[PDB]
Amino acid sequence: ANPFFSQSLAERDASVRGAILKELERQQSQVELIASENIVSRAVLDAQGSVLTNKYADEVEALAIERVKRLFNAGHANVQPHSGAQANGAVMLALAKPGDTVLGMSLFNALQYGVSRDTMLIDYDQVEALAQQHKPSLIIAGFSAYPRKLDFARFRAIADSVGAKLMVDMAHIAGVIAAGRHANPVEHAHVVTSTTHKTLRGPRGGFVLTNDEEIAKKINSAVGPLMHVIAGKAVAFGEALTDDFKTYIDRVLANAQALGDVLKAGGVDLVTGGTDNHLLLVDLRPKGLKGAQVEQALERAGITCNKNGIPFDPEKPTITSGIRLGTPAGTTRGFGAAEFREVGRLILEVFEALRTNPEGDHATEQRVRREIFALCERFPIY
Amino acid sequence: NANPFFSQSLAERDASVRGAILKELERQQSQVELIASENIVSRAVLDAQGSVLTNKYAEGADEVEALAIERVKRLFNAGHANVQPHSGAQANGAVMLALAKPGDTVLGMSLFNALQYGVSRDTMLIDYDQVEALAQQHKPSLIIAGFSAYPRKLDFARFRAIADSVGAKLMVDMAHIAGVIAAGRHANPVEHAHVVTSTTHKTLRGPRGGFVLTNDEEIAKKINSAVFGPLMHVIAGKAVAFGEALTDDFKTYIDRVLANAQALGDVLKAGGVDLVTGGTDNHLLLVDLRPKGLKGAQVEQALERAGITCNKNGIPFDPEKPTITSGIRLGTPAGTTRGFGAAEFREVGRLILEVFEALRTNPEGDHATEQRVRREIFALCERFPIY
């Protein structure tokens, strides 16, 4: 009988309502190709919007833990971190000493390894080379939005060779791993970290996995809490345990191949020449285009992505020679191969306009935007 | 929508999580929450937190943020605001780095070289001359006021004078009393502090989170740099709560919160326990259990079994270990939100006293009494349903 309790946001707050509606329209009417973005289930929304917020100014945590352990075949889990970065931070604070040398990927004395200038593939001989050299206490695999498989066993071998622990940040590929469509790092790393959003299609947040009990205790110590968010994690982990999630990931992967092939046929390059996952790293050089200019034009055209510096990019970082695309969001809304090929066609249309007008072609962008709107309306969300 | 991913509720899809949610609802529905930092958010805030705004900035201004900013500025008559902090501690942390250099002495309340001031052993109140003497001696670069769950007014003007006298900045952490200030029922530290920090929950009845206020644009710039992925749905929740707080209805809420604390405190006092400072100027009650020879932990544990949640709380200069303590801390915000008035809080006080008395013979607990009180608590809450 009390409106504080009875009335909706929509009924009470016109301005916020308006803002939410504009955001809904953004999500409904544009194609989201940002690789880290996704669209959560109504169930995850219900969790985040639950009365669990009114606490700790727990069953759901137990559920999240048991589910994630099952999902990734891990002996131990911590589902408390508020973010992937915070998970990573907790692990380092637990597995490393100040002044330690830590060897990580890039696409505490922080040392970086990357990919080969000539193949765009991970430098394993060179990762080892360099581990051997600098004697890191910790080696970190993953972390980077890399479009090819990671050889965790090889990473672990290298680790072992120099008396280092192996940490894997699977944040960019967690959903792929969960569906069994990528090697599971849990089987090879001393510790695994991840985000709960992105390809796991949950709320923003983190978690940590290990098979080692003593590592688990250190993790727990080194690591809110937002119980409604934890509920959301539980919901998402539960979803990922289902066959429907396996099918989702299957389509994500297939959709990335479809889109990638179209872009290549259309005369751009892909870093590493393709993908093993949901990620496409587009090299715009063959068309003499620039990352920032392309990102901007695509957005005007109703397609969102990220400019992206390619390995050994000849452009300064505010410019770049690439964009990064991912299929998770579009796949969630129901896109299949045909739809992603259409998206490709439209992207290529914008590319071609930019070749004679790098600053943008309004006419082309508008047409594309409208076609994007039409495509999206055939695949409604929420 | 045709797709169950989009069309079906949590209730329909996830029985186990739904069950957990229902259990939590029942906890909130059938117990009296007296934890002073706890509250019960509006359906509107829930809607925001459960909005599609979650599907943004996965890789780490915006309309909802601009709304939050406009609103909190108006609410606290502040020239500048940052609504990004994920917590009160995060807000405090950022301001400390803004305003203070490593190795600096910082002088803050307790009930960097971190130094503390408290209340007078004499008056059990802040002694501003004592605080000033500490400042003069230790020359802090930063003085922090608030922060502590102190049940009396804070003289921010005087804190500023003290700070000036030693060339220190003044920070006020108003987390524990933000709602009271928002309603105009406590002096506003924005008028006196270089910077003010707060949480968005507690007496502001929003989502968990923090914010930072200042009237000084240069400090604002520094704050913004210090504070810098965002939860847009949470920011929306902040916006909603700030909007609610701007209303006359919110002023009435605080009015009731305050009166309710007086009512509850009166009963406890008449019942033969003491209140630290002898009462309260806000929503807080610091109960001193010594007259009944009771301990905080034992009392907290017993009350919880009796369906009344509070925190054990060390009194100033508590002779007991901090895991034990000689007190409990109570607050009226949550109960007030569900509709309790003075009479209802007097009833709660009566029931609390029943538990105290059982414990005077059986400090480890009395099931009979606890379960009886629990039933009476259930019946009370039933008259004031939530959600």
Short mmCIF file of N, CA, C and O in Angstrom, two decimals, chain B residues 85-161:
data_model
loop_
_atom_site.label_atom_id
_atom_site.label_comp_id
_atom_site.label_asym_id
_atom_site.label_seq_id
_atom_site.Cartn_x
_atom_site.Cartn_y
_atom_site.Cartn_z
N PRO B 85 32.83 6.67 -7.03
CA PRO B 85 33.33 5.68 -6.07
C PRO B 85 32.38 4.52 -5.81
O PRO B 85 31.18 4.69 -5.68
N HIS B 86 32.97 3.33 -5.72
CA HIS B 86 32.19 2.10 -5.56
C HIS B 86 31.85 1.87 -4.10
O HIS B 86 31.04 1.01 -3.74
N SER B 87 32.49 2.67 -3.27
CA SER B 87 32.28 2.59 -1.83
C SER B 87 32.72 3.83 -1.11
O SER B 87 33.41 4.69 -1.65
N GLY B 88 32.32 3.88 0.14
CA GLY B 88 32.64 5.00 1.01
C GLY B 88 34.13 5.02 1.26
O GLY B 88 34.76 6.08 1.29
N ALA B 89 34.69 3.82 1.41
CA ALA B 89 36.11 3.68 1.74
C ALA B 89 36.93 4.13 0.54
O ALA B 89 37.99 4.72 0.68
N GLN B 90 36.39 3.85 -0.64
CA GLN B 90 37.08 4.18 -1.89
C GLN B 90 37.08 5.70 -2.06
O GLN B 90 38.03 6.30 -2.56
N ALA B 91 35.99 6.31 -1.60
CA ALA B 91 35.84 7.77 -1.69
C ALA B 91 36.84 8.39 -0.73
O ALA B 91 37.55 9.33 -1.07
N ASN B 92 36.88 7.84 0.47
CA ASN B 92 37.76 8.36 1.51
C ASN B 92 39.20 8.24 1.04
O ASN B 92 40.04 9.12 1.24
N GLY B 93 39.46 7.12 0.39
CA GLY B 93 40.82 6.77 0.01
C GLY B 93 41.33 7.76 -1.01
O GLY B 93 42.49 8.19 -0.98
N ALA B 94 40.44 8.13 -1.90
CA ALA B 94 40.79 8.99 -3.04
C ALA B 94 41.08 10.39 -2.53
O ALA B 94 42.00 11.06 -2.98
N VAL B 95 40.29 10.81 -1.55
CA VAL B 95 40.40 12.16 -1.04
C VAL B 95 41.68 12.28 -0.24
O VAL B 95 42.35 13.32 -0.24
N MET B 96 42.04 11.19 0.42
CA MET B 96 43.23 11.20 1.27
C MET B 96 44.48 11.34 0.40
O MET B 96 45.46 11.99 0.78
N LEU B 97 44.40 10.78 -0.80
CA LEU B 97 45.52 10.81 -1.74
C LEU B 97 45.55 12.15 -2.45
O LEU B 97 46.60 12.63 -2.88
N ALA B 98 44.38 12.75 -2.57
CA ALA B 98 44.26 14.05 -3.20
C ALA B 98 44.98 15.06 -2.34
O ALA B 98 45.83 15.82 -2.80
N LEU B 99 44.58 15.05 -1.07
CA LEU B 99 44.88 16.13 -0.14
C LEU B 99 46.12 15.92 0.72
O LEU B 99 46.63 16.86 1.32
N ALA B 100 46.57 14.68 0.81
CA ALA B 100 47.68 14.35 1.70
C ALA B 100 48.81 13.66 0.96
O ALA B 100 48.60 12.91 0.01
N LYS B 101 50.02 13.95 1.42
CA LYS B 101 51.24 13.36 0.86
C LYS B 101 51.71 12.18 1.70
O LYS B 101 51.51 12.14 2.91
N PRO B 102 52.35 11.19 1.06
CA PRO B 102 52.85 10.09 1.88
C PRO B 102 53.78 10.59 2.96
O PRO B 102 54.66 11.42 2.71
N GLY B 103 53.56 10.08 4.16
CA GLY B 103 54.40 10.40 5.30
C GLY B 103 53.77 11.48 6.14
O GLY B 103 54.16 11.72 7.28
N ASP B 104 52.78 12.14 5.54
CA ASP B 104 52.00 13.15 6.26
C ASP B 104 51.32 12.54 7.47
O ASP B 104 50.97 11.36 7.49
N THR B 105 51.14 13.39 8.47
CA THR B 105 50.33 13.07 9.65
C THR B 105 48.90 13.46 9.37
O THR B 105 48.61 14.56 8.90
N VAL B 106 48.00 12.52 9.62
CA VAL B 106 46.57 12.73 9.44
C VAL B 106 45.88 12.49 10.76
O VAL B 106 46.12 11.48 11.43
N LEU B 107 45.02 13.43 11.13
CA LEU B 107 44.35 13.40 12.43
C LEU B 107 42.87 13.20 12.22
O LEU B 107 42.20 14.05 11.66
N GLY B 108 42.38 12.05 12.68
CA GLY B 108 41.00 11.63 12.46
C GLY B 108 40.31 11.09 13.69
O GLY B 108 40.94 10.70 14.68
N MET B 109 38.99 11.09 13.64
CA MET B 109 38.19 10.60 14.77
C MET B 109 38.19 9.10 14.87
O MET B 109 38.11 8.36 13.88
N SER B 110 38.28 8.66 16.12
CA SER B 110 38.03 7.27 16.47
C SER B 110 37.30 7.21 17.81
O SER B 110 37.65 7.90 18.76
N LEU B 111 36.27 6.38 17.85
CA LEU B 111 35.49 6.16 19.08
C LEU B 111 35.98 4.91 19.81
O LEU B 111 35.33 4.44 20.75
N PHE B 112 50.63 7.11 5.53
CA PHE B 112 50.31 8.17 6.47
C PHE B 112 50.63 7.80 7.90
O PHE B 112 50.57 6.63 8.31
N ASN B 113 50.97 8.83 8.65
CA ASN B 113 51.07 8.75 10.11
C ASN B 113 49.69 9.07 10.67
O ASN B 113 49.33 10.24 10.84
N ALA B 114 48.94 8.02 10.94
CA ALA B 114 47.54 8.14 11.38
C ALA B 114 47.45 8.34 12.87
O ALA B 114 47.85 7.48 13.67
N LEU B 115 46.92 9.50 13.23
CA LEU B 115 46.68 9.87 14.61
C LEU B 115 45.19 10.03 14.85
O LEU B 115 44.42 10.37 13.96
N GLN B 116 44.79 9.76 16.09
CA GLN B 116 43.37 9.76 16.44
C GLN B 116 43.03 10.74 17.54
O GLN B 116 43.82 11.01 18.45
N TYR B 117 41.83 11.27 17.42
CA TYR B 117 41.18 11.95 18.53
C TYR B 117 39.86 11.25 18.79
O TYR B 117 39.29 10.59 17.90
N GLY B 118 39.40 11.34 20.02
CA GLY B 118 38.11 10.78 20.41
C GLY B 118 37.30 11.75 21.22
O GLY B 118 37.38 12.97 21.04
N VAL B 119 36.52 11.20 22.13
CA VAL B 119 35.72 12.02 23.04
C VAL B 119 36.45 12.18 24.36
O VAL B 119 37.41 11.48 24.66
N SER B 120 35.95 13.14 25.13
CA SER B 120 36.52 13.45 26.45
C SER B 120 36.13 12.38 27.46
O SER B 120 34.99 11.92 27.49
N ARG B 121 37.10 11.96 28.26
CA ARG B 121 36.84 10.96 29.29
C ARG B 121 35.91 11.57 30.31
O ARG B 121 35.27 10.88 31.11
N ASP B 122 35.83 12.89 30.24
CA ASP B 122 35.07 13.67 31.22
C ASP B 122 33.62 13.73 30.81
O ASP B 122 32.72 13.23 31.50
N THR B 123 33.42 14.34 29.65
CA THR B 123 32.09 14.70 29.15
C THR B 123 31.52 13.66 28.19
O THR B 123 30.32 13.60 27.94
N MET B 124 32.41 12.84 27.65
CA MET B 124 32.01 11.77 26.75
C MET B 124 31.59 12.40 25.42
O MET B 124 30.98 11.78 24.55
N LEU B 125 31.95 13.67 25.29
CA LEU B 125 31.75 14.43 24.05
C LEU B 125 33.08 14.86 23.44
O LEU B 125 34.10 14.89 24.13
N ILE B 126 33.06 15.19 22.16
CA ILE B 126 34.23 15.82 21.54
C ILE B 126 34.56 17.10 22.30
O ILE B 126 33.68 17.91 22.59
N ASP B 127 35.83 17.22 22.66
CA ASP B 127 36.35 18.44 23.28
C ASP B 127 37.22 19.13 22.24
O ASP B 127 38.31 18.67 21.93
N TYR B 128 36.71 20.22 21.69
CA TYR B 128 37.34 20.85 20.52
C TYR B 128 38.67 21.49 20.87
O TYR B 128 39.58 21.58 20.04
N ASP B 129 38.81 21.87 22.13
CA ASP B 129 40.06 22.45 22.61
C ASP B 129 41.11 21.35 22.70
O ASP B 129 42.27 21.56 22.37
N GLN B 130 40.67 20.16 23.10
CA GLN B 130 41.56 19.01 23.19
C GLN B 130 42.02 18.62 21.80
O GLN B 130 43.18 18.28 21.58
N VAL B 131 41.10 18.70 20.85
CA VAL B 131 41.40 18.33 19.47
C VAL B 131 42.37 19.35 18.89
O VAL B 131 43.31 19.01 18.17
N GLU B 132 42.14 20.60 19.24
CA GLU B 132 42.97 21.69 18.72
C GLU B 132 44.39 21.54 19.23
O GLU B 132 45.36 21.75 18.50
N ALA B 133 44.50 21.15 20.49
CA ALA B 133 45.82 20.97 21.11
C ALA B 133 46.57 19.84 20.42
O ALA B 133 47.79 19.91 20.22
N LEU B 134 45.84 18.81 20.04
CA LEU B 134 46.44 17.66 19.34
C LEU B 134 46.97 18.11 17.99
O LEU B 134 48.05 17.72 17.55
N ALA B 135 46.18 18.96 17.34
CA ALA B 135 46.55 19.47 16.02
C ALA B 135 47.80 20.33 16.12
O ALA B 135 48.68 20.28 15.27
N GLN B 136 47.85 21.14 17.16
CA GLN B 136 48.95 22.08 17.33
C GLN B 136 50.22 21.32 17.59
O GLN B 136 51.31 21.72 17.18
N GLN B 137 50.08 20.18 18.26
CA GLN B 137 51.26 19.44 18.70
C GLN B 137 51.82 18.61 17.57
O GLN B 137 53.03 18.47 17.42
N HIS B 138 50.92 18.05 16.77
CA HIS B 138 51.30 17.02 15.80
C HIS B 138 51.35 17.54 14.38
O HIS B 138 51.86 16.88 13.47
N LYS B 139 50.81 18.73 14.20
CA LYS B 139 50.83 19.41 12.90
C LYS B 139 50.40 18.51 11.74
O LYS B 139 51.16 18.28 10.81
N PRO B 140 49.16 18.01 11.79
CA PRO B 140 48.68 17.21 10.67
C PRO B 140 48.45 18.06 9.43
O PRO B 140 48.21 19.25 9.54
N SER B 141 48.57 17.42 8.28
CA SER B 141 48.35 18.11 7.01
C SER B 141 46.89 18.00 6.63
O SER B 141 46.37 18.74 5.79
N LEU B 142 46.25 17.05 7.30
CA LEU B 142 44.85 16.71 7.04
C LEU B 142 44.14 16.30 8.32
O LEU B 142 44.62 15.42 9.05
N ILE B 143 43.01 16.93 8.56
CA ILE B 143 42.12 16.57 9.66
C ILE B 143 40.85 15.99 9.06
O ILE B 143 40.28 16.54 8.11
N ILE B 144 40.43 14.87 9.62
CA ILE B 144 39.21 14.19 9.24
C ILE B 144 38.21 14.23 10.38
O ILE B 144 38.52 13.87 11.51
N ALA B 145 37.01 14.70 10.04
CA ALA B 145 35.89 14.72 10.96
C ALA B 145 34.78 13.83 10.42
O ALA B 145 34.71 13.56 9.22
N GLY B 146 33.92 13.41 11.32
CA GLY B 146 32.91 12.40 11.02
C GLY B 146 33.55 11.04 11.12
O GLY B 146 34.30 10.76 12.04
N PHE B 147 33.24 10.22 10.12
CA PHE B 147 33.82 8.89 9.97
C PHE B 147 33.30 7.92 11.01
O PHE B 147 32.96 6.77 10.71
N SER B 148 33.24 8.41 12.25
CA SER B 148 32.80 7.58 13.38
C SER B 148 31.30 7.68 13.57
O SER B 148 30.69 8.69 13.24
N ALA B 149 30.74 6.60 14.11
CA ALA B 149 29.30 6.54 14.42
C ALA B 149 29.02 7.23 15.75
O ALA B 149 28.71 6.61 16.76
N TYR B 150 29.15 8.55 15.70
CA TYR B 150 29.03 9.43 16.87
C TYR B 150 27.60 9.97 16.95
O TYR B 150 27.07 10.48 15.97
N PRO B 151 26.95 9.83 18.12
CA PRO B 151 25.52 10.13 18.19
C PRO B 151 25.17 11.57 18.52
O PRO B 151 24.02 11.86 18.86
N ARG B 152 26.15 12.45 18.44
CA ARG B 152 25.88 13.87 18.69
C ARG B 152 26.35 14.75 17.54
O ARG B 152 27.10 14.32 16.66
N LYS B 153 25.89 15.98 17.57
CA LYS B 153 26.23 16.97 16.54
C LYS B 153 27.73 17.15 16.45
O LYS B 153 28.44 17.06 17.45
N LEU B 154 28.18 17.41 15.23
CA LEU B 154 29.58 17.76 14.95
C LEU B 154 29.68 19.21 14.50
O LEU B 154 28.96 19.65 13.60
N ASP B 155 30.58 19.94 15.14
CA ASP B 155 30.74 21.37 14.86
C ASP B 155 31.76 21.56 13.75
O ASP B 155 32.94 21.71 14.02
N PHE B 156 31.28 21.55 12.52
CA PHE B 156 32.20 21.55 11.36
C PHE B 156 32.93 22.88 11.25
O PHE B 156 34.05 22.95 10.75
N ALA B 157 32.28 23.93 11.70
CA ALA B 157 32.85 25.28 11.58
C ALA B 157 34.10 25.32 12.44
O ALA B 157 35.12 25.89 12.06
N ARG B 158 34.01 24.65 13.58
CA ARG B 158 35.08 24.65 14.57
C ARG B 158 36.20 23.76 14.10
O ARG B 158 37.38 24.06 14.27
N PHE B 159 35.83 22.65 13.47
CA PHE B 159 36.84 21.76 12.88
C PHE B 159 37.63 22.53 11.83
O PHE B 159 38.83 22.37 11.70
N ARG B 160 36.94 23.38 11.08
CA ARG B 160 37.61 24.15 10.01
C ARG B 160 38.56 25.17 10.61
O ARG B 160 39.64 25.42 10.08
N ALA B 161 38.14 25.74 11.73
CA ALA B 161 38.95 26.75 12.43
C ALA B 161 40.21 26.10 12.95
O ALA B 161 41.32 26.66 12.88
#
